[PDB]
Scaffold this active site. Structure first.
Site, PDB file in Angstrom:
ATOM      1  N   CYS A  52       0.720  -1.144   0.102  1.00 35.50           N
ATOM      2  CA  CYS A  52       0.041   0.104  -0.213  1.00 35.50           C
ATOM      3  C   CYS A  52       0.883   1.201  -0.020  1.00 35.50           C
ATOM      4  O   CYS A  52       1.842   1.353   0.694  1.00 35.50           O
ATOM      5  CB  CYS A  52      -0.798  -0.180   1.268  1.00 35.50           C
ATOM      6  SG  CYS A  52      -1.787   1.399   1.516  1.00 35.50           S
ATOM      7  N   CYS A  73      -7.040  -3.286   3.562  1.00 33.32           N
ATOM      8  CA  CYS A  73      -6.859  -1.857   3.614  1.00 33.32           C
ATOM      9  C   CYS A  73      -7.599  -1.195   2.602  1.00 33.32           C
ATOM     10  O   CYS A  73      -8.579  -0.481   2.543  1.00 33.32           O
ATOM     11  CB  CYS A  73      -5.367  -1.401   3.700  1.00 33.32           C
ATOM     12  SG  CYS A  73      -5.274   0.348   3.637  1.00 33.32           S
ATOM     13  N   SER A  93       0.592   3.495   1.607  1.00 30.87           N
ATOM     14  CA  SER A  93       1.004   4.026   3.131  1.00 30.87           C
ATOM     15  C   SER A  93       2.431   3.526   3.714  1.00 30.87           C
ATOM     16  O   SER A  93       3.060   4.046   4.272  1.00 30.87           O
ATOM     17  CB  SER A  93      -0.134   3.736   4.101  1.00 30.87           C
ATOM     18  OG  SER A  93      -1.215   4.613   3.815  1.00 30.87           O
ATOM     19  N   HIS A  99       4.974   5.583   2.404  1.00 32.22           N
ATOM     20  CA  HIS A  99       5.101   6.750   3.197  1.00 32.22           C
ATOM     21  C   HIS A  99       6.029   6.721   4.525  1.00 32.22           C
ATOM     22  O   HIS A  99       6.669   7.580   4.761  1.00 32.22           O
ATOM     23  CB  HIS A  99       3.650   7.396   3.494  1.00 32.22           C
ATOM     24  CG  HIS A  99       2.846   7.809   2.431  1.00 32.22           C
ATOM     25  ND1 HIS A  99       1.629   7.739   2.442  1.00 32.22           N
ATOM     26  CD2 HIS A  99       3.134   8.164   1.295  1.00 32.22           C
ATOM     27  CE1 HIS A  99       0.850   8.193   1.599  1.00 32.22           C
ATOM     28  NE2 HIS A  99       2.084   8.520   0.609  1.00 32.22           N
ATOM     29  N   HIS A 148       0.690  -3.583   6.336  1.00 34.44           N
ATOM     30  CA  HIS A 148      -0.515  -3.467   7.215  1.00 34.44           C
ATOM     31  C   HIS A 148      -1.694  -3.979   6.451  1.00 34.44           C
ATOM     32  O   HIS A 148      -2.857  -4.028   7.124  1.00 34.44           O
ATOM     33  CB  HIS A 148      -0.919  -1.941   7.589  1.00 34.44           C
ATOM     34  CG  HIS A 148      -1.097  -1.155   6.395  1.00 34.44           C
ATOM     35  ND1 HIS A 148      -0.090  -0.458   5.461  1.00 34.44           N
ATOM     36  CD2 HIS A 148      -2.293  -0.653   5.916  1.00 34.44           C
ATOM     37  CE1 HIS A 148      -0.649   0.167   4.696  1.00 34.44           C
ATOM     38  NE2 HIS A 148      -1.859   0.192   4.817  1.00 34.44           N
TER      39      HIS A 148
HETATM   40 ZN   LIG Z   1      -3.054   1.130   3.458  1.00 33.04          ZN
END
Ligand SMILES: [Zn+2]
Ligand SMILES: [Zn+2]
Ligand SMILES: [Zn+2]
Ligand SMILES: [Zn+2]
Lengths: 374, 374
Positions: A46, A174, A48, A51, A67
């Site tokens: 993902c 997610c 994220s 990030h 995650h």
């Molecule tokens: Zn995510």
């Protein structure tokens, strides 16, 4: 067999910001009270997670990220009641403790036990279950799925249908839930409504899916990359718009297209400009606009509050507004009932050890979603 | 007696921006089809009327302003069915045509026939019923209540209980309904919730009233003028906070006071800073913040979209989110049923000819509300 003892396995460790993931031999401690040790089967890559690499989502390093995943329970700590060894499971990056004022609220889902607001990078008890050559390694959002085995708190795991294809349903961890819930749960898209979706990556496609599930009559995908239009239509977009095709501002184009504004709009991209465009393009008296993501280093946006005074509603949410432990099994059952498809979202599959190639695919825009398999 | 002919009467004309109102002899034409001529009994002085004077609410001049009023029907034009000569009535500055997509929407109320978005300063038919020495004078928001007689479109008037005290219920024409609906209709304040109200003028007191009607357990009034605290408590505030009393930012004070954020917040003042403060001070996962007014010359505000991503909802509305022709008679009946008090909002009463003194009272902050009587 492995219950009660340390497991030596491989994980992808991020030792420092702006570095590739390092495949390392780690030691994963056994689960303490109210903890669950899980053998990973598949994990999605993902934005994220990227990030964390960039240093824009600040969390303690070194860290095992990841995650969005699914696996099988290897063992349970003392007092665990909601899962058992051998169960299929999806780790919950937004926990559902069931006790806090948010979990007790009919519309809240951002449980106060989350590790997102002020990340500690630990288990609930303030410690870590991971070591690499005796050096402690941080958890990420109480999940840490970029490892052959992980340990999560009971409040951060949900049991799912034993017949589930884990290589597909990991998306419920997610990306799919986030977009789908934003339509079905947060916006509450109504039958026959007109929707506009800004961004046609995996999360945007999931929003389109949700708008379709809710029975939207028109679903307008918006993106400057026209090669995303084909898949957007496959999953339910009725038309697609490329803002670069136009001489006038996009909000005007959409307002004219929808005879005075859309019912629901969604900003997926994370861009401050389209957040305001998405708000503006919904009907001024009753339009609802939903922010599905914000880059973690976002600056302030500038907007005229007159956009709201006419009757617009602006909202955001984490994890599609879903109470996570309640909703994830229901979403898997919806998939098992063939209510929706997950295959159109999966463009690449790689073995776990090729995690860096998967992040290159993410960063280049080439993949909708890459799944890593164990 | 006067039906079918021109009426010569007095009105307060605004000939030019930034001038006092001029009391003039005007001629009021008889009502055409689907129009209603009304003898004014009382009219409130609202901030928005002052915005016309300042040039900040742009509408064609010269103009007869006034939008918050009550009167008695003098005569009806052809085909009028909803009111009759002698009926008590309240002009509706937000019309309810019943036909447009907004009027047909369960949650919209900003009818597309409004004269607010792009003001023409006329009747629905594009003409004016007012002349002063043969010079045409503009209408304001299809109401124009600063005159002994006015003519309004049928869609802009509501019949109310014949026993109503017009000198009180005129507040339902704007200020009371706007604040009260913002709580009861727009926010939908729930029993036992905690509310924060930023601004304790007439509209803010009306929000407090609505929060009380809805059964809020805590209602925190916020204002830098501590002489407004007494009345705020009279009408239902459980505590009042003066931000100037503190060394820390107000949103932190409120977040700490409410054990992690309020359920509902309201920005009444019109100030860009408290709009963002009011959003921030609601609970991050399920808080709702409502903008009750925006000065018509407002610049852009700056805010971090992360405030919304956690689960907050931000909304605004006109006229308290009430469908106006439906709601006004119900609000009057609620008053006649003694469900709420209007007297605490009325601090000054003046004869109509003293309209300029009433605007001085408004501008100085001395009045909560001044009612002008005919
Ligand atoms: Zn995510
Ligand atoms: Zn919780
Ligand atoms: Zn209408
Ligand atoms: Zn007003």
């Amino acid at each position: 067999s492995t219950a009660g003892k340390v497991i030596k396995c491989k994980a992808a460790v991020l030792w420092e910001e702006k570095k590739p993931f390092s495949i390392e031999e780690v030691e994963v401690a056994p689960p303490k009270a109210h903890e669950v040790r899980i053998k990973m089967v598949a994990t999605g890559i993902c934005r994220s997670d990227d990030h964390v690499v960039s240093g824009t989502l600040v969390t303690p390093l070194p860290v095992i990220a990841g995650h969005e995943a699914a696996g099988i329970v290897e063992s349970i700590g003392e007092g665990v009641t909601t899962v058992r060894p051998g169960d299929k499971v999806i780790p919950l990056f937004t926990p559902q403790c069931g006790k806090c004022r948010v979990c007790k609220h009919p519309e809240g889902n951002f449980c106060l036990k989350n590790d997102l607001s002020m990340p500690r990078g630990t288990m609930q008890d303030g410690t870590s279950r991971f070591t690499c050559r005796g050096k402690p390694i941080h958890h990420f959002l109480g999940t840490s799925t970029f490892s052959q085995y992980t340990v999560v708190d009971e409040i951060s795991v949900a049991k799912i249908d034993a017949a589930s294809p884990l290589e597909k349903v990991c998306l419920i961890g997610c990306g799919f839930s986030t977009g789908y819930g934003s339509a079905v749960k947060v916006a509450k898209v109504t039958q026959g409504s007109t929707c506009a979706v800004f961004g046609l990556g995996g999360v945007g496609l999931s929003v389109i899916m949700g708008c379709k599930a809710a029975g939207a009559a028109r679903i307008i995908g918006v993106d400057i990359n026209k090669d995303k239009f084909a898949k957007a239509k496959e999953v339910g977009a009725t038309e697609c718009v490329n803002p670069q095709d136009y001489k006038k501002p996009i909000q005007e184009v959409l307002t004219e297209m929808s005879n005075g504004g859309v019912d629901f709009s969604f900003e997926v991209i994370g861009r401050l400009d389209t957040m305001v465009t998405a708000l503006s393009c919904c009907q001024e008296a009753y339009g609802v606009s939903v922010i599905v993501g914000v880059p973690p280093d976002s600056q302030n946006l500038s907007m005229n509050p007159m956009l709201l005074l006419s009757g617009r509603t602006w909202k955001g949410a984490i994890f599609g507004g879903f109470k996570s432990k309640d909703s994830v099994p229901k979403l898997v059952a919806d998939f098992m009932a063939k209510k929706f498809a997950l295959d159109p979202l999966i463009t690449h599959v790689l073995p776990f050890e090729k995690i860096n190639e998967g992040f290159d695919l993410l960063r280049s825009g080439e993949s909708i979603r890459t799944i890593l398999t164990f």
